[PDB]
Amino acid sequence: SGFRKMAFPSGKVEGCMVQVTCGTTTLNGLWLDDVVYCPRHVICTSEDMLNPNYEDLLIRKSNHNFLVQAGNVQLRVIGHSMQNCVLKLKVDTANPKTPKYKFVRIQPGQTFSVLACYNGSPSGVYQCAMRPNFTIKGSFLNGSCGSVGFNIDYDCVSFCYMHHMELPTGVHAGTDLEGNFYGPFVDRQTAQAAGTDTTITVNVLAWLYAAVINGDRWFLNRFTTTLNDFNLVAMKYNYEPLTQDHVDILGPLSAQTGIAVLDMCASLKELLQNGMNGRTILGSALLEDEFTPFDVVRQCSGVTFQ
Amino acid sequence: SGFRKMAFPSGKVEGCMVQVTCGTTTLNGLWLDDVVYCPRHVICTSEDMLNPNYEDLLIRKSNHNFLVQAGNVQLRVIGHSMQNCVLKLKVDTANPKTPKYKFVRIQPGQTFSVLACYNGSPSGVYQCAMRPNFTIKGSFLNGSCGSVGFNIDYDCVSFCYMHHMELPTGVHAGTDLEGNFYGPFVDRQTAQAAGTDTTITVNVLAWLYAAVINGDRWFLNRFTTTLNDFNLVAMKYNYEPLTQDHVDILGPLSAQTGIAVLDMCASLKELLQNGMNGRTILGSALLEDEFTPFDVVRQCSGVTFQ
């Protein structure tokens, strides 16, 4: 029993983290077979970050200007290429710890684990959600750019995120592993607005189902509701609207618990309009939206990985 | 910036998890050099758990009754020994993934990472605290016994915990890696009372210092207080009393933030007697006690590991 914000085991990713240095700047890189993926702003100094012309900067750089280090071994950069915001640093040796991997562009509301690294060395791992405004509320100090987010499909690591920037608001922005930012952000030290951040309703519902499974039932109310009527209230509290696809995804949880998805929505509706009144759900005083319906089923069924 | 309940990278431990089978029962084991540590109740069936005589049960078992498996390779048990609650299964091959390790018995209030495993395969990792009543509020399904808790001293894994039992109250009990339970618990399927669970005050104070560092300052109050007077209020709200040793440990945080430890205590005192009034601290509506002062300094300074 019990419920925790569990991260994926990080071992398969720890073996892929390297230190990349270009000039004075040093950040983290992702060493898959013979390419080292890293933020392209590794080529920038603090001044360049205010208004960087990446094409012009990269052209000033050559293969021998990139120092890639893994532990106490050095990697030779035999080629460099820029893919939208990522530097692909082709090195001479393929990473022997290269796992079965996949590059995936996740959707907002999906969760993944972040391996926070400094100088190419792992410092910790945590599970987070891609917010609906494509930011992540992470924990990144100076020199953590290039840290990656990932999921594990039992033997296959799905890399979905690379950290690039801390917005002046203290939230974090980054790309997929093809260098395409999540959201409207650019890798420039300028004021950048992230959208309104909404609560991931399908995730909250998934977590309420976890609460029931683990014995928290007080929020099961005497009401029901319609999908149209629930969404009306969700909009007022900055919850993203629920679709039938979200209902279909919650199916297995509905079947395990005997609670129809629309009945759970009525419970959540009342939680929204009347609060939790100094009571908790799974040790939390706030409604949690960083567990997907799959996380809950994974954790409540104990699926393992390689 | 930002703050997350970060777990240690799990890779060095993933390589030590094995599946141990004795009869019908199968749980997790810890494969360090040529010993496999696992809960001794692996030798018990469901009936034996109600009233097990472990000496008499183990004597009915022989070396060939223990099936230790790592992935798709099998380990031969060349010896078996029982150390207080742990089975030391001597196998014929030393774990080549054996990290620099240490067995440590932690004190309540200290934090560590748990690698939750099923069938010897890792399913996820989370950071938790040893509660003052020597339980852990974990996430353990059937077949997760033997999962281990650990800290990492940059190249040295300090194994401090092995999960043995879920108490009928849904909380979790286990031992150090010498088989000595944390707390008054026994590995028997009987009703067992854990003590009153108090909040780890030095940890809450450490986390308030993290709040200040990350820009949360509203709880900084107009009051001060004495250590004797603060402890008087802490006792009322089931907070463990603060000692000068706790004050000495918070020193570096006091120096970084310019806030004297006794001033932070006055802030916490008012938080206790008047609540948080629908406001948050680091995204939390409750006071967090699963960050030690070392966790905060580690996370706020970005220390890395091997």
Question: How many of the other CB atoms lie within 10 Å of CB of B291?
Answer: 26
Listed resolution, Å: 1.9
Please answer whether residues A83 and A179 qualify as being in contact, where contact means their C-beta atoms are separated by less than 8 angstroms: yes
Alpha helices in B113-239 (DSSP H): 201-213, 227-236
Chain B residues near residue A170 by CB distance under 8 angstroms: 1-2, 214-215
β strands within chain B, DSSP E: 17-22, 25-32, 35-39, 66-70, 73-75, 77-83, 86-91, 100-103, 111-118, 121-129, 148-152, 156-166, 172-175
Q: Which two tokens stand for residue B184?
A: 């008054």
Q: How many angstroms separate the CA atoms of A81 and A88, rounded?
A: 5
Please answer whether residues A59 and A199 qualify as being in contact, where contact means their C-beta atoms are separated by less than 8 angstroms: no
Q: Which two tokens stand for residue B181?
A: 């339970």
Tallying the residues shown for chain B, one arrives at 306
Q: How many angstroms separate the CA atoms of A151 and B202, rounded?
A: 34
For residue A51, the SS3 value is coil
Please answer whether residues A129 and A110 qualify as being in contact, where contact means their C-beta atoms are separated by less than 8 angstroms: yes
Q: How many angstroms separate the CA atoms of B115 and B127, rounded?
A: 9
Would you call A178 exposed, middle or buried from its count of C-beta atoms within 10 A (0-12, 13-18, 19+)? middle
Q: What is the CA radius of gyration of chain A?
A: 21
Residue type, B131: R
From chain B residues 5-34, the ones with a CB under 8 A of any chain A CB are 5-12, 14-15
Q: How many angstroms separate the CA atoms of A159 and A282, rounded?
A: 29
DSSP B238: T
Q: How many angstroms separate the CA atoms of B130 and B110, rounded?
A: 6
From chain B residues 77-106, the ones with a CB under 8 A of any chain A CB are none
Question: How many of the other CB atoms lie within 10 Å of CB of B158?
Answer: 18
Answer whether A304 sits within 8 Å of B118, measured CB to CB.
yes
Longest dimension (CA), chain B: 69
CA A147 to chain B, closest CA, distance in angstroms equals 13
Q: Which two tokens stand for residue A215?
A: 């014995």
Q: How many angstroms separate the CA atoms of A124 and A145, rounded?
A: 14
Q: How many angstroms separate the CA atoms of A104 and A106, rounded?
A: 6
User: Which among B26, B123, B152 is the top mutation candidate for probing chain A, defined by the most A β-carbons within 10 Å of its own β-carbon?
Assistant: B123
Q: Which two tokens stand for residue B99?
A: 């990290």
Positive or negative, the Cα torsion across A218, A223, A224, A229?
negative
CA B60 to chain A, closest CA, distance in angstroms equals 31
Would you call B66 exposed, middle or buried from its count of C-beta atoms within 10 A (0-12, 13-18, 19+)? buried
Please answer whether residues B212 and B171 qualify as being in contact, where contact means their C-beta atoms are separated by less than 8 angstroms: no
Chain A residues near residue B210 by CB distance under 8 angstroms: none
Q: Which residue has the tokens 């010896």?
A: B79
Q: Which residue has the tokens 């601290």?
A: B281
For residue A46, the SS3 value is coil
Q: How many angstroms separate the CA atoms of A227 and A244, rounded?
A: 8
Q: Which two tokens stand for residue A97?
A: 């710890």
From chain A residues 210-239, the ones with a CB under 8 A of any chain B CB are 214-215
Q: What is the CA radius of gyration of chain B?
A: 21
Rounded to whole angstroms, what are the CA distances from B85 to A264, B50, B107, B148?
A: 43, 16, 19, 14
Answer whether A123 sits within 8 Å of B6, measured CB to CB.
yes
Q: Nearest CA to B64 among B41, B92, B44, B85?
A: B92
Q: How many angstroms separate the CA atoms of A124 and B167, rounded?
A: 29
Q: What is the dihedral of CA A5, A98, A181, A235, to 10 degrees?
A: -30
Chain A residues near residue B124 by CB distance under 8 angstroms: 4, 6-9, 299
Which experimental approach was used here?
X-ray
Q: Which residue has the tokens 């001794």?
A: B40
Q: b/e string for A225-254 if b means 16 or more Cβ within 10 A? A: bebeebbebbeeeebbebeeebbebbebbb
Please answer whether residues A6 and B125 qualify as being in contact, where contact means their C-beta atoms are separated by less than 8 angstroms: yes
End-to-end CA distance of chain A: 23
Please answer whether residues B256 and B175 qualify as being in contact, where contact means their C-beta atoms are separated by less than 8 angstroms: no
Rounded to whole angstroms, what are the CA distances from A12 to A16, A58, B116, B170?
A: 7, 31, 16, 31
Q: What angle do helix axes A261-274 and A227-236 make, rounded to 10 degrees?
A: 30
